[PDB]
Design a protein around this nucleic acid. Structure first.
Lengths: 128, 143, 110, 84, 99, 101, 60
RNA sequence: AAGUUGGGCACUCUAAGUUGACUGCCGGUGACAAACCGGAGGAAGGUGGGGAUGACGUCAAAUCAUCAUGCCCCUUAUGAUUUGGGCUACACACGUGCUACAAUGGACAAUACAAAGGGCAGCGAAACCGCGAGGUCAAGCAAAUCCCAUAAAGUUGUUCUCAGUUCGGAUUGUAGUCUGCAACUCGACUACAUGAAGCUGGAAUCGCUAGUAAUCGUAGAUCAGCAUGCUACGGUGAAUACGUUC
């Protein structure tokens, strides 16, 4: 067969996505995602590439992910897929890039620095 | 300065419910906030067998004022309030008037409240009124 | 009363109805109720005279009474009397390690 | 605590084992900080350098939550306005 | 099954040029060389204060680079033995010969 | 209130004296949570009398300062500054109302 | 006092631990590493000399 | 069992050199120019993210107690070794921060995902002991290899059903572990019990424009021993920005 490929990176969580045509069926490191990510029932938004690009679908899923917790790990899914569909064919950049899906929003946790204590807040002041 | 879109809610394919979760999503713990909310769905969708969107759009439109005011010494002015701040207004008076019910469970007070204003009752319809009482009492000295 | 000790609660679960008595906490619960092979299940006193053999027998095997206020009274008259460098500090609100009394109103100081 | 088991300074021990045979003496200038109780130090009365000077005591039977590392609370009246 | 070494430099080119000239010595009388395999170059820190007495909040950071640089070659001859032990400079490396 | 003074041991007549004379100003408004004073002595070789003080305020603070030969005259200056300060701070303000439209 | 504390630290002990290792150059006792035995401010004082790497500055 | 074995370096990842974002390019606008808005592409489009960096001068700012040093003074001492106390006492206030005042909760049992650093007689692996602390030997290791290590929050079912509560664990004392000869004044930590106020805080007042605030944990220095501190790392994840009245 022929597995298209996209590779996503958010929040230490790399998404080596082995997309391939077929049915559409999830294996987060040889394991379905549904039980896996706490809790979680937000997987509608993860097949967004199917929601809006070559809609409905589907193409079959293998994926090799690691790093971080579920969220940014559940966000490299998108860039993995969409980058894999632009790899499939950039025909639908005009419905992908209208939803972005290639902007790996590089925001992260900034360094720690003076004043920052158990939660990030500027100090309290002296008074009277 | 723009305002932090929610894509949809992947429950109901809605939007408003997420806008509300983020006010309930204490500690960022959406798991427990969407927990207590889904509980809210089955419970209220049991009592008076209906949908959320019916009691939701109903009761969210029953407390939602169309006016409120502001100061500027401080002179308090009447203004047609803008809509998204009016949305988060209904959301906020809703939930903040909710928890003070003196009731134990996560959800019963909530459904009690939306069901309250669903029949044009409840203190959030009341504050809607007093807003609409000060307003048009606030026309003289400020308009 | 009821079986022994002091003031068994009413319609409270065994695993903490025990914890009320003067000198029962939590691990003590699973101990003394396991020594009669019972379960509470769930918030409430659920006893008959059946397991009363073992819940009445086990409870006699410890000093769950004012004798622990006696033996306490002995420990304190002991510590205070000797010289005692911990008999002055028996009152300040200090354990054996000192406590650097600066913030103390306190729960353990007047 | 101690690691199985009790210890003593042992240069005081060289004193007590000396004064232990005859009609036991009851006068001691000493240091008595790292020396814990045991019943050969009896027959003898202890005045320990308190932090400034030495300070006697009649040794007595009830001495179980006690030891000679110090028995004069050295903060010296008190330090405080109120009493105990 | 070949020579393997570990180089640690605190200026980030000498690893590369030293690696390649000693590679030249290594393939002169030999062949079958695996390259300068990069290792993550772990770091350090020293949270130093910009003061003498007080003002603890106004501080600053010195740090350090600790690079590891993993180089091999297979199929020895005693002339590439000398390729190891013929040229070592610049010796700021932590050169360690192995097999 | 907060009184640390270097190269000198404080006494008590100065306390009642200075702090009572400061208390006279509850004409306006006292408002007396904090009152930090400050001193030092400093060879010149005529050689000093430092008289420095804060008299902080609701939502703001202040400074009065003086150096003298002597603490009585030198103090009448930490006062008869703060007076004029507090006075103004209250005048101020702006009421001359005036309808609009 | 200071000059004889210098001799206090380097003469013998009774046992392992009633002993300190302050900084060599300055006599700064507190807040000093055991890696180089160099105080808070001696390293800055000799960091600018740039003898060692060392870096200085601001990537972390 | 297993990226372990043989194989492959494809791919994440890996440390060095390479462009790419420079109003660069297009449209509008504008004294045409400076320049503003939008568009295109792009991952980044408006000094991209953040740090490094603090002009002239003000505070006779802090520092002789970092270091050196002008003047003064001690020198059988203000210099010195030695043991013990003590720098930690508390009628008091203040400031600082940490922790509860609970059912999104509390407790039970099963389960998943991080990053970053450190390690030689130092990181301690299993197996073994025990309520735990901890100890038995020693697997592996100058390290992308062996250890610290296991992640925490979450999630899973159970129950608790609004109490001064299964909240709270202060307190006091009982009993063990580790440290250094040394735990009284003065190290924490381990099981027992005891279970205080406190049911969200008046007047007052502070931080914050988004991965923020808010929130859960990890590890480094100091280190025989010792962190509600600091530092660094992450994982989870909001409302508000009309307008500059004031």
């Amino acid at each position: 067969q022929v597995e298209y490929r996209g590779t996503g990176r958010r929040k230490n969580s790399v998404a080596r996505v082995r997309l391939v045509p077929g049915e559409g069926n999830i294996t987060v490191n040889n394991r379905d995602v549904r039980e896996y990510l706490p809790f979680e029932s937000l997987i509608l938004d993860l097949n967004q590439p199917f929601d809006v690009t070559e809609t409905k679908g589907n193409y079959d899923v293998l994926v090799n992910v690691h790093g971080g917790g579920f969220t940014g790990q559940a966000q490299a899914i998108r860039h993995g897929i969409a980058r894999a569909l632009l790899e499939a064919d950039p025909e639908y950049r005009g419905s992908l890039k209208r939803a972005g899906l290639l902007t790996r929003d590089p925001r992260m946790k900034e360094r720690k620095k003076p004043g920052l204590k158990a939660a990030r807040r500027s100090p309290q002041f002296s008074k009277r | 300065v723009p305002k932090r879109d929610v894509l949809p809610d992947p429950i109901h394919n809605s939007k408003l419910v997420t806008k509300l979760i983020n006010k309930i999503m204490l500690d960022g713990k959406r798991g427990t906030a969407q927990r207590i909310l889904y509980s809210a769905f089955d419970l209220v969708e049991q009592r008076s067998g209906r949908d959320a969107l019916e009691v939701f759009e109903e009761a969210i439109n029953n407390i939602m004022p169309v006016l409120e005011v502001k100061a500027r010494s401080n002179y308090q002015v009447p203004v047609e309030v803008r809509p998204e701040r009016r949305t988060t207004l209904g959301l906020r008076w809703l939930v903040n008037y909710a928890r003070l019910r003196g009731e134990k469970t996560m959800e019963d007070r909530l459904a009690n409240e939306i069901l309250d204003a669903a029949n044009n009752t409840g203190g959030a319809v009341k504050k809607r009124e007093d807003t609409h009482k000060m307003a048009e009492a606030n026309k003289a000295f400020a308009h | 009363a009821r079986i022994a000790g002091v003031d068994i609660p009413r319609e409270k679960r065994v695993v903490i109805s025990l914890t009320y008595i003067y000198g029962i906490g939590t691990s003590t619960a699973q101990k003394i109720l396991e020594e009669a092979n019972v379960s509470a299940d769930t918030r409430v006193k659920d006893l008959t005279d059946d397991e009363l053999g073992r819940i009445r027998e086990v409870v006699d095997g410890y000093k769950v009474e004012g004798d622990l206020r006696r033996e306490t009274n002995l420990n304190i008259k002991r510590l205070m009397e000797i010289s005692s460098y911990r008999g002055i500090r028996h009152r300040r609100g200090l354990p054996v390690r000192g406590q650097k009394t600066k913030n103390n109103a306190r729960t353990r100081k007047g | 605590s101690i690691k199985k088991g009790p210890f003593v300074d042992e240069h005081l021990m060289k004193k007590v084992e000396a004064q232990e045979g005859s009609e036991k003496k009851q006068v001691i200038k000493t240091w008595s900080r790292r020396s814990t109780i045991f019943p050969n130090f009896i027959g003898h009365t202890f005045a320990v350098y308190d932090g400034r000077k030495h300070v006697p005591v009649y040794v007595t039977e009830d001495m179980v939550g006690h030891k000679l590392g110090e028995f004069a609370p050295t903060r010296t009246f008190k330090g405080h306005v109120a009493d105990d | 099954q070949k020579i393997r070494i570990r180089l640690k430099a605190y200026d980030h080119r000498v690893i590369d040029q030293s690696a390649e000239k000693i590679v030249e010595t290594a393939k002169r009388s030999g062949a079958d060389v695996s390259g300068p395999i990069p290792l993550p170059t772990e770091k350090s820190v020293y949270t130093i204060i910009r003061a003498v007495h007080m003002y603890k909040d106004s501080r600053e950071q010195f740090e350090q680079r600790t690079h590891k640089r993993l180089i091999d070659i297979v199929n020895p001859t005693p002339k590439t033995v000398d390729a190891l032990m013929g040229l070592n400079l610049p010796s700021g490396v932590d050169i360690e010969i192995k097999l | 209130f907060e009184i640390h003074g270097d190269n000198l041991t404080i006494t008590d007549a100065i306390r009642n004296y200075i702090e009572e004379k400061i208390g006279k100003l509850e004409r306006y408004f006292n408002d007396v949570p904090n009152a930090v004073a400050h001193v030092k002595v400093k060879t010149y070789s005529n050689s000093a009398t430092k008289i420095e003080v804060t008299i902080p305020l609701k939502n703001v603070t202040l400074r009065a300062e003086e150096r003298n030969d002597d603490l009585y005259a030198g103090i009448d200056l930490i006062n008869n500054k703060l007076e004029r300060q507090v006075r103004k701070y209250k005048t101020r303000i702006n009421r001359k109302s005036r309808d609009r439209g | 006092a200071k000059t004889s504390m210098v001799a206090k630290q380097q003469k013998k002990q009774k046992y392992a631990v009633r002993e300190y290792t302050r900084c060599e150059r300055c006599g700064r006792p507190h807040s000093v590493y055991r890696k180089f035995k160099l105080c808070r401010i001696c390293f800055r004082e000799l960091a600018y000399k740039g003898q060692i790497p060392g870096v200085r500055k601001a990537s972390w």
